[PDB]
Amino acid sequence: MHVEAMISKHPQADRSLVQCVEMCFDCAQTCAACADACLGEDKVADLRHCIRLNLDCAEICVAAGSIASRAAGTEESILRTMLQTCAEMCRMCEEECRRHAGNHEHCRICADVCKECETACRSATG
């Protein structure tokens, strides 16, 4: 990623922020991929809720990542509210993917990414 390089060059220019942005994009992609993997499973009907949460988590993580990419300055921002929502979304999505992780390795990986992204986003709200 180029998060760190771009922050340093912004005319209004944060480790926790870099980590948050990087994780949001990673987690967005991972959850998009996890929704599609679950869709392809023989046991798709068991994975409805998980697919739905991953779609929401992908959507919210792209939004959060994008907003945070614009948060390199002191101006008022939705940033902290958005990161709190994102942390809650990643927590919910982690729990459901974790429940399937013994059965589907894609959900193990995705639960781990959601957990890390939850922590990164919560940490960026401090």
Between 28 and 67, how does the x/- string for binding to Na ion read (CB under 5 A)? ----------------------------------------
> Tokens at residue 34, please?
């996890």
Decide if residue 101 touches its own copies (CB under 8 A).
no
| Contact yes or no for 30/55 (Cβ under 8 A) | no
> Tokens at residue 31, please?
């959850």
Integer Cα distance of 29 and 82 in angstroms: 18
| Contact yes or no for 53/96 (Cβ under 8 A) | yes
Q: Which residues bind its own copies (CB under 8 A)?
A: 1-3, 5-7, 9-12, 21, 25-26, 28-30, 32-37, 39-42, 44-45, 48-49, 51-52, 55-56, 58-60, 62-63, 65-67, 69-70, 72-73, 75-78, 81-82, 84-85, 88-89, 92, 104-106, 109-110, 113
